[PDB]
Amino acid sequence: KNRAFLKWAGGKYPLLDDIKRHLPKGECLVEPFVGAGSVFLNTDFSRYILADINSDLISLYNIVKMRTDEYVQAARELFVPETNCAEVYYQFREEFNKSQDPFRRAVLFLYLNRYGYNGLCRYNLRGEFNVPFGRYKKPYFPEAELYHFAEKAQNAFFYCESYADSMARADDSSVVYCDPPYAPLTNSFTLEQQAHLAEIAEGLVERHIPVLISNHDTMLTREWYQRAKLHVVKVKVDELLALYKP
Amino acid sequence: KNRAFLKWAGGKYPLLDDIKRHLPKGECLVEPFVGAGSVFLNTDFSRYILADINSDLISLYNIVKMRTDEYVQAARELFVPETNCAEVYYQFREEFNKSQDPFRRAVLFLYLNRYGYNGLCRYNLRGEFNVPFGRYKKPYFPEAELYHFAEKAQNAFFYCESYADSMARADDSSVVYCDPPYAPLNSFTLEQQAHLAEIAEGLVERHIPVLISNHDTMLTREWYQRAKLHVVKKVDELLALYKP
DNA sequence: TCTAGATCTAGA
DNA sequence: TCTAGATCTAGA
Ligand SMILES: Nc1ncnc2c1ncn2[C@@H]1O[C@H](CSCC[C@H](N)C(=O)O)[C@@H](O)[C@H]1O
Ligand SMILES: Nc1ncnc2c1ncn2[C@@H]1O[C@H](CSCC[C@H](N)C(=O)O)[C@@H](O)[C@H]1O
Numbered sequence: 001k002n003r004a005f006l007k008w009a010g011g012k013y014p015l016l017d018d019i020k021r022h023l024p025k026g027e028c029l030v031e032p033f034v035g036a037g038s039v040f041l042n043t044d045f046s047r048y049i050l051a052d053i054n055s056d057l058i059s060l061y062n063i064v065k066m067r068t069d070e071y072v073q074a075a076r077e078l079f080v081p082e083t084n085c086a087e088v089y090y091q092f093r094e095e096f097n098k099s100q101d102p103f104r105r106a107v108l109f110l111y112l113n114r115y116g117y118n119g120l121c122r123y124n125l126r127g128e129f130n131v132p133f134g135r136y137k138k139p140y141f142p143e144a145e146l147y148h149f150a151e152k153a154q155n156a157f158f159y160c161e162s163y164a165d166s167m168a169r170a171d172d173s174s175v176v177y178c179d180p181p182y183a184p185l186t187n188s189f190t191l192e193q194q195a196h197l198a199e200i201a202e203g204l205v206e207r208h209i210p211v212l213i214s215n216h217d218t219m220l221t222r223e224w225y226q227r228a229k230l231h232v233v234k235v236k237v238d239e240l241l242a243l244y245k246p
Numbered sequence: 247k248n249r250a251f252l253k254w255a256g257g258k259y260p261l262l263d264d265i266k267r268h269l270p271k272g273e274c275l276v277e278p279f280v281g282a283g284s285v286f287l288n289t290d291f292s293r294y295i296l297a298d299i300n301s302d303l304i305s306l307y308n309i310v311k312m313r314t315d316e317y318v319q320a321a322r323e324l325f326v327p328e329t330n331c332a333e334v335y336y337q338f339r340e341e342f343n344k345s346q347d348p349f350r351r352a353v354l355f356l357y358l359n360r361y362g363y364n365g366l367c368r369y370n371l372r373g374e375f376n377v378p379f380g381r382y383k384k385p386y387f388p389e390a391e392l393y394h395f396a397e398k399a400q401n402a403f404f405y406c407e408s409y410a411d412s413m414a415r416a417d418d419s420s421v422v423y424c425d426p427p428y429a430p431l432n433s434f435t436l437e438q439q440a441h442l443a444e445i446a447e448g449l450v451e452r453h454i455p456v457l458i459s460n461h462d463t464m465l466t467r468e469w470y471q472r473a474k475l476h477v478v479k480k481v482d483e484l485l486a487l488y489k490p
Numbered sequence: 491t492c493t494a495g496a497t498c499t500a501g502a
Numbered sequence: 503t504c505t506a507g508a509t510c511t512a513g514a
Contacts, residue, residue: 009491117512117513117514118491118514120491122511122512124510124511124512125510125511130511130512130513131512131513132512132513132514133513133514134514135514186509186510187509249494253493253494253495254494254495255495255496256495256496257494257495259494260494363506363507363508364494364495364497364508364510365494365495366495368505368506370504370505370506371503371504371505376505376506376507377506377507378506378507378508379507379508380508380509381508381509382493383491383492384492386492386493386494428496431496461496480496481496
């Protein structure tokens with residue numbers, strides 16, 4: 001098992017065995033909600049179309065893909081004892097919010113992800129990252145994970161777009177894996193988009209493109225995914241894998 | 247630290263360490279602007295005189311002090327999923343505004359404080375509470391905080407009166423802590439702000455220490471010119487100590 | 491994920 | 503002068 005280099009709310013590392021068990025085979029895997037990329041990192045498709053609405057995330061991935069050595073070098077300098085304190089963390093959070101440079105923002109993004117509170121990635125309505133200091137003994141610098149990501153990324157394309165747009169990219173040889181923000185147990189993922197996601201999936205399988213969706217197992221998701229074969233993963237509420245197979 | 251059971255604009259929980267560092271010792275603590283009472287709840291004076299101009303607040307505190315179990319039981323019934331929606335919130339707001347019963351108003355006051363917009367407590371000129379719905383996922387019911395408040399309240403007296411009147415209650419064994427509405431970065435006027443400092447000067451002349459907290463501005467530096475000023479840490483906070 | 495809470499704004 | 507809605511902010 002390969003770990004993602006980012007800590008991420010909704011990370012699927014623990015559910016990889018269950019996901020892979022139900023994920024059909026194909027030439028290409030499309031992930032409309034790539035997040036930290038645990039599925040991408042633990043599968044063997046010949047190519048990937050990885051997308052997410054988070055622009056900082058997609059920019060970061062392209063930089064890791066194309067400028068690996070420069071990135072690892074710059075990022076590694078921030079993972080020292082000297083940056084592990086509140087005064088430094090908040091100055092870097094401010095530096096990040098004021099910068100318009102893709103490379104520096106990407107470098108700081110990793111620092112904030114691992115020195116910040118519980119690995120949260122959160123912004124206010126003005127687009128400013130506002131996660132507080134996480135007070136860790138020693139954040140782990142994901143050097144091996146970054147190199148592995150960059151290697152796998154040579155067969156991927158990253159897109160910053162909403163799910164309806166990346167899913168429209170799927171074709172005959174694609175398999176689509178959707179891991180939308182969790183459903184209930186502004187400027188976020190709504191219940192209407194949750195329902196709409198299921199609708200697009202029904203449209204794709206009608207065209208012989210398989211789709212697997214992961215979400216909590218609730219009365220609502222049961223309803224949204226009524227046209228899929230449901231698989232429960234016992235784990236609080238259980239996890240659900242809705243498979244739309246041609 | 248102990249949390250107040252009400253959410254409250256101007257709450258001093260984050261500033262408790264700083265306040266206590268400069269608050270003198272004595273038998274009795276007088277708080278002319280008690281608000282949610284975080285200082286009262288995190289100090290250990292033998293007795294307290296707690297006052298505020300808000301009548302609903304003082305009425306509520308007396309009910310919590312004297313009828314703790316009945317109050318908690320009644321209040322707890324409103325902290326359920328079924329009351330967490332706009333339709334119910336606005337009907338309870340109207341119920342509160344039409345009621346003249348101290349107990350029911352006290353019970354609804356807590357509901358409105360935690361289901362309403364950002365813990366605001368606001369009324370129009372007709373005396374009607376007009377804070378909108380706050381749309382929280384699950385407002386916290388402060389059961390532990392209510393019991394602690396009631397316990398501490400056994401050594402307090404609550405008064406609904408303006409600051410000049412409660413400060414006149416201080417005597418030889420009193421320490422006065424004032425947390426007036428914040429100074430600009432009826433309502434609380436700049437004249438009352440200045441008047442407050444004047445009373446403090448009169449109290450310390452009589453050997454009664456007074457600590458006042460406010461924002462650190464050029465106006466407050468002027469009002470509290472006769473005090474020993476301490477700056478804490480958005481503008482900085484100022485603690486003005488009038489020590490005999 | 492939980493939680494307190496220093497405002498802003500249009501306008502019969 | 504006032505009324506009354508606001509679907510957030512940011513630390514832990
Ligand atoms: N409308 C939208 N379109 C595409 N992605 C979206 C979206 N709304 C939210 N997201 C993205 O949804 C992702 C859910 S987390 C997915 C995590 C991933 N399976 C892993 O294992 O790491 C987040 O990264 C979020 O940025
Ligand atoms: N003239 C006046 N006399 C007494 N209290 C007044 C007043 N004008 C306003 N107030 C009260 O001033 C309080 C300021 S908030 C004080 C908060 C308190 N220290 C805490 O930690 O919770 C409010 O509760 C308000 O009702």
